[PDB]
Amino acid sequence: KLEKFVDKLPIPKVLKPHSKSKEMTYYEVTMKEFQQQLHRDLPPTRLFGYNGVYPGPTFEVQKHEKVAVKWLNKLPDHHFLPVDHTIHEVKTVVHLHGGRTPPDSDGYPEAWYTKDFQVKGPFFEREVYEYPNEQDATALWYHDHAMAITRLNVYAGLVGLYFIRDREERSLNLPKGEYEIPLLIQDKSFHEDGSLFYPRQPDNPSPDLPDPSIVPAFCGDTILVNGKVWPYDELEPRKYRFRILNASNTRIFELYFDHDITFHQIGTDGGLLQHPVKVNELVIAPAERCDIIVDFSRAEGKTVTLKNRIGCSGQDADPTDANIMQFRISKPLKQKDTSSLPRILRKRPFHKINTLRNLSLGASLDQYGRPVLLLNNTKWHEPVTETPALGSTEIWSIINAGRAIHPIHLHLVQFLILDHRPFDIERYQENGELVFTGPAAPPAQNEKGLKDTVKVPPGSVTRIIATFAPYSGRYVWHCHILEHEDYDMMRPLEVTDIRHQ
Amino acid sequence: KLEKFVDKLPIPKVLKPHSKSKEMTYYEVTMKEFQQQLHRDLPPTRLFGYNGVYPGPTFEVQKHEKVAVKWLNKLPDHHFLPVDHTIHEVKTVVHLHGGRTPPDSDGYPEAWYTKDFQVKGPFFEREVYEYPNEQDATALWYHDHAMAITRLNVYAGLVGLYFIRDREERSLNLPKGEYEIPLLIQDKSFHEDGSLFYPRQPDNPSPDLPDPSIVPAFCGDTILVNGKVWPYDELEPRKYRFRILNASNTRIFELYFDHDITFHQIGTDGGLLQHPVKVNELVIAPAERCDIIVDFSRAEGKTVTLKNRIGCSGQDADPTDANIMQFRISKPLKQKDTSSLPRILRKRPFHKINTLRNLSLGASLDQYGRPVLLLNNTKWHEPVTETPALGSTEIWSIINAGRAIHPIHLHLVQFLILDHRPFDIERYQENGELVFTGPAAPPAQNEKGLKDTVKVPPGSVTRIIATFAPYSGRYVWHCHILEHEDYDMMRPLEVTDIRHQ
Ligand SMILES: [Cu+2]
Ligand SMILES: [Cu+2]
Ligand SMILES: [Cu+2]
Ligand SMILES: [Cu+2]
Ligand SMILES: [Cu+2]
Ligand SMILES: [Cu+2]
Ligand SMILES: [Cu+2]
Ligand SMILES: [Cu+2]
């Protein structure tokens, strides 16, 4: 179903502010319900989107630029996706993923609000968010974060891009303009209606199981890029810059080109790497970003398809979800490609270690027999335990006793991945003891940079180092598989300033 | 007991040939029983060694140098280590690990011989081996390979070094002379006698168990380097070249320095890399080699200890086997360090791909209840199945359904590690179908060179690609955990020439 590579790759328009001064740059974005055609042969798709478009408008901000956004809710009173009323209306709150944001503008899950702020969550306090943008140039993105329905609102189309620029990044003569292309890759499933399909219950729903019921994992049979089903793009035989983002609910990608063409990765979630990394395949979990350079100069006239290697459970991808999009190197070379792939990308490096933390990834069963994925076997309602001090540098040991990868995400900060190491699963479930069973392995070279989301392998412990700065207050950390996050792999993160005790 | 860092680090003497001409360089090495003091506070240890020294003499050969060695057996009638007479006297045959050697001089396990060639194995042919040395510069090593008792003869002390030199390697101004130090690392256990300890049976043997009985794994409590228990070495504050080798029976090391000093790996088992790789920790399984450069120039007066992170089952090392040796940067800098750490090492890179092979790692139980580790669930007695054609390129998929790492080693060839990928263990032990459960991962950057031994992770499939050239005939491939190789993880490898039908 759905013929591949018939629609052209859409580029989200750069959002224009309502007012821009030397003090502040003020934006207004509204969440509206609408229809949008996602494939040449599909009927329009009912979606929740920012400024009536999917994906939302793209923010272009600068370092130090004080940006203010008023996120307006104009969505209906009822959701068009199956809402599980038993895990915790259309509630909305906007979170800038990876943004160095004070807690009052970070998009707390319980700071949600309905249309026109008429019904507010218990943590609501502001209608106009402010982003100081005191972080280095990188690729961020914004999406909904309302509690218990984050999997639905994000899947409904509430995602958008957000770029930060530096004088350091611009000093690098990188492919810019039309030669910098963002790839917001997502997976979805459609009815014959053309509308989104999201399961109401697991496969064989028992009678007394709640209806609707949250599923432990969802992944669609159709791959989209920038809101277009298996699109295509006509490029020039030169160097391009791809800002790749995986905004799926669950699906992990393993991207590769069907020709002998290599990705040159120059940046991660947090910003630029120190030197480019020559990689043939990109393993990108949900919410992970990859800043890559691709050279098509030796490929004039060829048809290069961006491919995916793995399915939803890590198996070999079917030659339907094995396709991302198709590049056709047929556009004539306008000007000479004078863009650069410099050997050095940063110069500047990325302490005392004040705190150590052990955090377990697991699951429990509720009264209906559903798996409840948990952080430290602790529900979201429970009191806060991850309480780092303002300015503290900590090493988090993330212990994955599950069957598959968990992409764990921390708010506010950008961390570094230390190493992965396997441990004894049986000893861990019977004793709580962490006995290692193999040598430690550093992260891949293209994951040595600043990141806010890390793939924690199954049966292994992932160590990250993080400096909780420069804002104190209430944040959260969670797994970015939204089906896990909503029930209930999410926990509060309280950064505390110390002054007089 | 055994105080650490009280004996100086021995350097094995280079072996002098008996006769050297334009045609051939002829050597003679004898295996003799002798006693050698391995620690300052240990009585001399009974050993089997080449030329009455442990480790054996070091060969220094050239590329294209036709080297001939006549390995002579002068060993006693009785082996001092416990011999299992149920798995398949002092039988000996010398194998040049990693050498591009014709089969008649490769050291086939059943080409063994007793003292003065009295009794000869069923595959014996010649007394003088010839090594054409038509391969690039690398660090090899020679050790005993007699069938059913390879774990005993190697543990008895029948190991030695063998270096090949190139004009390419020499063109690199690498640290040479006394500033190139080989680190032959091993582990052993000692009786109060000072003699070697090696278990006769597993821990709790039923009376139905044979006596002696092979164990699935042995690792000693004491770490040796170049035949000296926890030695030390006084170095100058400059760059050194370490040719590290793991010659243990089973133990896998994770080497690191207790100071902020980085390994710059320049070569692997098969020879030089293309570019140096900055690594903080070296994971070296048995038979693996690591050519690394260490810069001590900023450590004048410091005491730098080479440490080991992991133990026998991959757990955290005990602060006794966590120590390898101690480097004391106290020798004054003689001459100015003019050696080079060049950014380019090889220039020239490392085909059609004719054959694909799936090879499983597992274990069965014999009549006595002992685990029998097997390749393709097939005994060594059984007919040969790995029959590549001369000059053909193959991709071997090594499927490890076991609990721990298996260092799989192939003879004759040097291969390139493609990737690792997890699979479903439970589905694999039911219908034998291979279902992957995660993304593929390329090898670490410092394991991208030519290799002849690869760490196959548990629950993962390690893909290797090899070209079987230029000698046809009978070789073997096996796991280099000697307790596994002897019972019975060793299978024949037949390279067949084709020319007429
Ligand atoms: Cu996010
Ligand atoms: Cu976030
Ligand atoms: Cu998860
Ligand atoms: Cu979040
Ligand atoms: Cu060997
Ligand atoms: Cu070998
Ligand atoms: Cu093994
Ligand atoms: Cu061998």
Describe the structure in your own words.
Two copies of one chain form a homodimer. By secondary structure, chain A is mainly β. Chain A folds into three domains: 19-166, Immunoglobulin-like (Sandwich); 177-328, Cupredoxins -  blue copper proteins (Immunoglobulin-like, Sandwich), CATH 2.60.40.420; 355-495, Sandwich (Immunoglobulin-like). In chain A, 4% of the residues lie in helices and 36% in strands. Chain A is built from four helices and 30 strands. Chain A has a seven-stranded mixed sheet, with no helix packed on it. Chain A is globular, with a radius of gyration of 22 Å. At the A-B interface, loops of A face loops of B. The complex binds copper (II) ion (8 copies). One copper (II) ion binds at residues 373, 406, 479, 481, 484, 489 of chain A.
Summarize the structure.
The structure is a homodimer of 501-residue chains. The first copy, chain A, has helices at 150-155, 167-171, 425-431, 482-485; strands at residues 19-20, 25-36, 45-50, 59-62, 67-73, 94-97, 128-131, 138-144, 159-165, 180-188, 222-225, 228-229, 232-234, 239-246, 253-257, 263-267, 272-279, 282-284, 289-295, 303-308, 323-328, 355-365, 371-375, 393-400, 406-410, 416-422, 453-456, 460-467, 473-479, 490-495.
What is the CATH topology classification name of the largest domain in chain A?
Answer: Immunoglobulin-like
Strand content of chain A: 35-45%
Q: How helix-rich are the residues of chain A, as a percent range?
A: under 10%
Report strand order across the widest sheet of chain A.
Answer: 12-11-10-14-19-16-17
PDB class: oxidoreductase
Keywords: oxidoreductase
Assembly: dimeric
Entry title: Laccase from Bacillus licheniformis
